[PDB]
Amino acid sequence: ADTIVAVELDTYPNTDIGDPSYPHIGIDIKSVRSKKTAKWNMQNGKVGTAHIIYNSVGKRLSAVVSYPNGDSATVSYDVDLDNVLPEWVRVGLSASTGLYKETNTILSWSFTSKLKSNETNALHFVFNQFSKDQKDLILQGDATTGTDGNLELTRVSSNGSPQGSSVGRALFYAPVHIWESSAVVASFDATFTFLIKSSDSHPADGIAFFISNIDSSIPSGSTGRLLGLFPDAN
Amino acid sequence: ADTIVAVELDTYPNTDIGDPSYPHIGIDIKSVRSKKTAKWNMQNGKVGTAHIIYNSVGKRLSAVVSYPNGDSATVSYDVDLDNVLPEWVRVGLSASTGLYKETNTILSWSFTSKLKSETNALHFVFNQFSKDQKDLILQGDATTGTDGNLELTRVSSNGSPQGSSVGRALFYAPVHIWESSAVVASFDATFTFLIKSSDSHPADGIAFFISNIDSSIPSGSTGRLLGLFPDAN
Amino acid sequence: ADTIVAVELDTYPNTDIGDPSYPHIGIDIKSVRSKKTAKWNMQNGKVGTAHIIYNSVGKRLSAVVSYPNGDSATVSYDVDLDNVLPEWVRVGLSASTGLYKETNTILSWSFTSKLKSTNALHFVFNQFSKDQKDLILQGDATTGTDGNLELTRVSSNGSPQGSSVGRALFYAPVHIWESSAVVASFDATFTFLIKSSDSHPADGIAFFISNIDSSIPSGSTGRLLGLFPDAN
Amino acid sequence: ADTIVAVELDTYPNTDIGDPSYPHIGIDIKSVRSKKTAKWNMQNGKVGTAHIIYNSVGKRLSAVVSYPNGDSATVSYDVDLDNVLPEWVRVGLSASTGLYKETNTILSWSFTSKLKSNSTNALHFVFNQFSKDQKDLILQGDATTGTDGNLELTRVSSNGSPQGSSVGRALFYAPVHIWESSAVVASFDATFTFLIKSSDSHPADGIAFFISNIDSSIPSGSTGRLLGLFPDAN
Numbered sequence: 001a002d003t004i005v006a007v008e009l010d011t012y013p014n015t016d017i018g019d020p021s022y023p024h025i026g027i028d029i030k031s032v033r034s035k036k037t038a039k040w041n042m043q044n045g046k047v048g049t050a051h052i053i054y055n056s057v058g059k060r061l062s063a064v065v066s067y068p069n070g071d072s073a074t075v076s077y078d079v080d081l082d083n084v085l086p087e088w089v090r091v092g093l094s095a096s097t098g099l100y101k102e103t104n105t106i107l108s109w110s111f112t113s114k115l116k117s118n119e120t121n122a123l124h125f126v127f128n129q130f131s132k133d134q135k136d137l138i139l140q141g142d143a144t145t146g147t148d149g150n151l152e153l154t155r156v157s158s159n160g161s162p163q164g165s166s167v168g169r170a171l172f173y174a175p176v177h178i179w180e181s182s183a184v185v186a187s188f189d190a191t192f193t194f195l196i197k198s199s200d201s202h203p204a205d206g207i208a209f210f211i212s213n214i215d216s217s218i219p220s221g222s223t224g225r226l227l228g229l230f231p232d233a234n
Numbered sequence: 235a236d237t238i239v240a241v242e243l244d245t246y247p248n249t250d251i252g253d254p255s256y257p258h259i260g261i262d263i264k265s266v267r268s269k270k271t272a273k274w275n276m277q278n279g280k281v282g283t284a285h286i287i288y289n290s291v292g293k294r295l296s297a298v299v300s301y302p303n304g305d306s307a308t309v310s311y312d313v314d315l316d317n318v319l320p321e322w323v324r325v326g327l328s329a330s331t332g333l334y335k336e337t338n339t340i341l342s343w344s345f346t347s348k349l350k351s352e353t354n355a356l357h358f359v360f361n362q363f364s365k366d367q368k369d370l371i372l373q374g375d376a377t378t379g380t381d382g383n384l385e386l387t388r389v390s391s392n393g394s395p396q397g398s399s400v401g402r403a404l405f406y407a408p409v410h411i412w413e414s415s416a417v418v419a420s421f422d423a424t425f426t427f428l429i430k431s432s433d434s435h436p437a438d439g440i441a442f443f444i445s446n447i448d449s450s451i452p453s454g455s456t457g458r459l460l461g462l463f464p465d466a467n
Numbered sequence: 468a469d470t471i472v473a474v475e476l477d478t479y480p481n482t483d484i485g486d487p488s489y490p491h492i493g494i495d496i497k498s499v500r501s502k503k504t505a506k507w508n509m510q511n512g513k514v515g516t517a518h519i520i521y522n523s524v525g526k527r528l529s530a531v532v533s534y535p536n537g538d539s540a541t542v543s544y545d546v547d548l549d550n551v552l553p554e555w556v557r558v559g560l561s562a563s564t565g566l567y568k569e570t571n572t573i574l575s576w577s578f579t580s581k582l583k584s585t586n587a588l589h590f591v592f593n594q595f596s597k598d599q600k601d602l603i604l605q606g607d608a609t610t611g612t613d614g615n616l617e618l619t620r621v622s623s624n625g626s627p628q629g630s631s632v633g634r635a636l637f638y639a640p641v642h643i644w645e646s647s648a649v650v651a652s653f654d655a656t657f658t659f660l661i662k663s664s665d666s667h668p669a670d671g672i673a674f675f676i677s678n679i680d681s682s683i684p685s686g687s688t689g690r691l692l693g694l695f696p697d698a699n
Numbered sequence: 700a701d702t703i704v705a706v707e708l709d710t711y712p713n714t715d716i717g718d719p720s721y722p723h724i725g726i727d728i729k730s731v732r733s734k735k736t737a738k739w740n741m742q743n744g745k746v747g748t749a750h751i752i753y754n755s756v757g758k759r760l761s762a763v764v765s766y767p768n769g770d771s772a773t774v775s776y777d778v779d780l781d782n783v784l785p786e787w788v789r790v791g792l793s794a795s796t797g798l799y800k801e802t803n804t805i806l807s808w809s810f811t812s813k814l815k816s817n818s819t820n821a822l823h824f825v826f827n828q829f830s831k832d833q834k835d836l837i838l839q840g841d842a843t844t845g846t847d848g849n850l851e852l853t854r855v856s857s858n859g860s861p862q863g864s865s866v867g868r869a870l871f872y873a874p875v876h877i878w879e880s881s882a883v884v885a886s887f888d889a890t891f892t893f894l895i896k897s898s899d900s901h902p903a904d905g906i907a908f909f910i911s912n913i914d915s916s917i918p919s920g921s922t923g924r925l926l927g928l929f930p931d932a933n
């Protein structure tokens with residue numbers, strides 16, 4: 001089974017598996033049941049921004065999700081990722097839909113990891129436009145790149161209609177060296193902008209930024225509440 | 235007085251004003267009496283590296299100080315800097331000596347400030363300090379070099395530190411460190427330093443700090459006050 | 468005199484002083500009389516992007532100005548800035564109007580310089596505050612409250628004013644070359660909105676590099692772009 | 700054959716294939732015969748720095764090689780890489796030895812690529828320390844990394860002596876999007892530091908930073924003067 005650190009933007013409360021009874025941002029460490037959540041007012045059809053911060057000094061995994069009117073939700077969990085994550089990982093964006101559905105449109109994704117000193121090893125990438133054949137992204141499941149310049153993690157119909165029982169992920173092509181014992185500071189940040197839209201009063205299931213073993217793949221059956229991330233809801 | 239946030243590398247235990255009883259790093263929030271400290275083994279005449287990190291999301295200001303052998307000290311403090319600093323600030327390095335002394339040499343210094351939101355950002359790096367470093371406001375006893383170095387406190391051309399000394403270097407531009415509509419207002423800073431002393435103890439330390447724009451060395455803030463504070467409250 | 472290096476987006480053909488007979492971009496080296504120009508189709512009331520890059524190794528100062536439709540103008544000039552600029556400088560944006568006028572609105576501005584053997588400076592403005600403390604505003608510039616930098620004088624339904632000159636300089640001096648720098652490079656990017664209902668628009672926006680103490684020269688409204696004392 | 704844009708630090712003059720009669724930095728466009736060279740004083744056993752810059756506005760491919768004493772050699776060639784390179788590439792470092800040899804030690808490598816339009820897609824990586832199992836590098840031929848934190852492009856013997864007839868390359872794992880038609884600026888730069896040490900009547904053959912097709916492979920027989928870059932000396 002893969003190892004997952006994720007920040008989930010969970011649009012659909014699955015109260016039978018420990019979701020609060022509201023849409024929430026969450027920090028997930030090796031379980032879909034978030035270690036920490038914050039109530040999130042998903043603004044339907046608006047462009048949201050998620051920013052994810054971690055460094056190995058503070059060891060605080062933090063995420064904010066904001067929309068341009070100003071509504072933000074933030075969540076943090078102190079967690080020592082040296083003890084969770086393989087040294088070398090892939091980083092990715094994941095989304096899913098189940099009985100209910102939403103567009104899980106990515107409009108930009110940036111990522112920076114650094115290992116300083118003690119000098120710096122670093123990876124940074126930015127995608128503000130996704131390309132039809134995006135050679136530095138590993139697309140899994142239903143994830144597709146436009147154009148439009150967007151990354152549709154899950155299936156959207158010809159007529160605009162998001163489809164249920166969809167899951168897809170984008171992972172950056174290069175392995176990322178997330179920690180290294182000799183490093184004084186290991187830090188990462190990620191930001192992505194997304195367009196979650198539902199004509200259903202029931203958007204589902206959400207979007208995650210995730211960190212994974214290098215060979216990570218969509219667990220069989222991880223549509224819906226499992227967010228393309230987990231094989232079960234344990 | 236000034237509003238001060240700082241990460242002190244405090245080489246001299248002033249246990250009478252709250253220092254722990256060893257060299258230490260500490261996070262100073264409007265007071266020289268740190269909100270959190272960690273024991274710090276300062277390695278005499280070694281080049282050390284201090285990394286300071288804040289994000290507005292985590293609301294946690296963290297510092298690590300390390301030397302090449304791997305030995306490191308870390309302090310974090312939970313704090314919302316929106317509640318502490320003014321929107322606009324200067325960032326700087328400060329050092330002092332007192333009745334005891336040490337070199338407070340800065341070999342490099344970087345800083346990055348970002349405000350989203352879109353994004354405003356400032357980043358500078360000094361790996362070399364010119365004799366005329368026009369983008370630094372030197373205050374008190376700093377000195378720009380050669381040795382290519384920034385000397386926060388008085389040394390002799392021949393390496394020897396001086397007592398009762400206080401010096402700061404502030405970056406020339408004001409920095410917009412937070413802003414009420416910023417969803418992320420983060421910064422980090424790193425400096426490398428060489429603290430050397432033949433004294434009976436080393437004193438007093440170097441701090442990275444953030445102050446109001448018009449911040450000057452407060453009267454009599456040599457020694458334990460680290461060029462930062464008007465008194466020890 | 469000030470020493471000036473600039474990339475002008477010159478919206479008004481001053482052919483008496485060597486402008487080409489069309490709006491143009493140019494590379495200004497110690498003179499308003501461009502060392503190199505390219506024809507520029509300014510798109511009125513559109514947002515444009517200027518990208519300036521100087522390659523210390525390549526010894527080449529290059530600019531593109533584009534608009535969202537893909538229309539671009541490009542100019543490069545081969546020049547060793549070690550022999551032109553003083554070592555310490557301020558960088559900034561300058562615009563002017565004269566007898567004809569345009570909005571000279573800056574919506575964003577970024578800048579990066581690096582001196583390697585590495586010192587660096589980078590700043591990005593995507594929004595300008597009404598009190599933007601890290602900008603030295605000169606003349607009729609003017610930031611906020613709409614998040615924009617208004618280099619010359621607009622009233623207030625956005626209607627441009629004539630005889631206006633305004634530049635904005637980053638508050639910190641920049642160490643733009645050094646004798647012992649193996650690489651002394653910079654780029655700048657600014658996005659702009661030039662709008663006019665005049666007969667022509669005038670006069671243009673420049674990115675400039677100048678001495679630290681550089682001020683708007685007396686009578687540098689108009690074709691002088693707030694940059695130069697005369698048109699030699 | 701692969702398509703190759705390289706900046707070569709060529710230590711050994713192969714005057715029978717158009718090299719000048721001195722060591723040199725060269726710009727190579729689809730030939731080992733540099734389009735532009737500059738005389739280079741290789742400082743044997745010193746750490747050199749090479750910086751390579753290009754953007755699609757000036758279209759000038761520039762390279763400098765310097766040593767701490769301040770000896771530098773600069774080379775530039777105007778060339779439109781849109782017309783040379785495939786849209787998507789891998790970037791790498793390559794070295795070779797033939798009859799004569801040298802260590803071709805890489806101590807750091809940074810690379811940044813950006814595609815800007817009207818305000819970006821970007822890749823940036825820095826290696827200041829190469830690790831024993833550096834998962835984001837594709838190592839080809841004799842190239843090895845770490846524990847000493849270096850990349851040895853070509854064979855160095857147990858006793859420190861560089862071996863002849865060696866070729867190795869390191870390519871960054873992810874494909875790079877080097878040009879894109881809708882971009883108003885495409886730029887890249889690369890920096891690497893290196894330590895070429897040789898013992899006799901002797902240094903060969905050089906180090907190149909190169910840009911190639913994604914599936915670029917060491918051409919058979921590309922030891923020696925071909926720098927691990929070219930199938931032949933044409």
Ligand SMILES: CO[C@@H]1O[C@H](CO)[C@@H](O)[C@@H](O[C@H]2O[C@H](CO)[C@@H](O)[C@H](O)[C@@H]2O)[C@@H]1O
Nearest residue numbers: 246331332333334335437438456457458459
């Ligand atoms: C020698 O120990 C000293 O005690 C003195 C009085 O008992 C007093 O002056 C102390 O302070 C001076 O020196 C230290 C270390 O340099 C500074 O921290 C002080 O601010 C002061 O300058 C010292 O504990």
Ligand SMILES: CO[C@@H]1O[C@H](CO)[C@@H](O)[C@H](O[C@H]2O[C@H](CO)[C@@H](O)[C@H](O)[C@@H]2O)[C@@H]1O
Nearest residue numbers: 012014097098099100101204205223224225
């Ligand atoms: C009406 O809500 C649902 O009750 C269903 C009956 O058991 C159940 O299938 C459904 O879950 C499905 O859809 C969810 C929202 O998309 C998703 O989280 C689940 O994994 C599943 O697909 C929900 O409980």
Ligand SMILES: CO[C@@H]1O[C@H](CO)[C@@H](O)[C@H](O[C@H]2O[C@H](CO)[C@@H](O)[C@H](O)[C@@H]2O)[C@@H]1O
Nearest residue numbers: 479481564565566567669670688689690691
């Ligand atoms: C009518 O056009 C003008 O011709 C005038 C007579 O020569 C002249 O004064 C005027 O120049 C002014 O306006 C220009 C465009 O705004 C400006 O470039 C000049 O410096 C001057 O202010 C323009 O040529």
Ligand SMILES: CO[C@@H]1O[C@H](CO)[C@@H](O)[C@H](O[C@H]2O[C@H](CO)[C@@H](O)[C@H](O)[C@@H]2O)[C@@H]1O
Nearest residue numbers: 711713796797798799800903904922923924
């Ligand atoms: C001593 O000069 C050599 O003459 C040899 C016989 O023709 C020849 O093989 C040799 O070239 C070899 O060594 C070079 C330096 O390493 C290398 O560039 C060649 O590719 C080849 O391996 C050189 O010309």
Ligand SMILES: [Ca+2]
Nearest residue numbers: 010012013014
């Ligand atoms: Ca859920």
Ligand SMILES: [Ca+2]
Nearest residue numbers: 244246247248
């Ligand atoms: Ca103390």
Ligand SMILES: [Ca+2]
Nearest residue numbers: 477479480481
């Ligand atoms: Ca003109």
Ligand SMILES: [Ca+2]
Nearest residue numbers: 709711712713
């Ligand atoms: Ca050769």
Ligand SMILES: [Mn+2]
Nearest residue numbers: 010019026034
């Ligand atoms: Mn959840």
Ligand SMILES: [Mn+2]
Nearest residue numbers: 244253260268
């Ligand atoms: Mn203390």
Ligand SMILES: [Mn+2]
Nearest residue numbers: 477486493501
């Ligand atoms: Mn002109």
Ligand SMILES: [Mn+2]
Nearest residue numbers: 709718725733
């Ligand atoms: Mn050659």
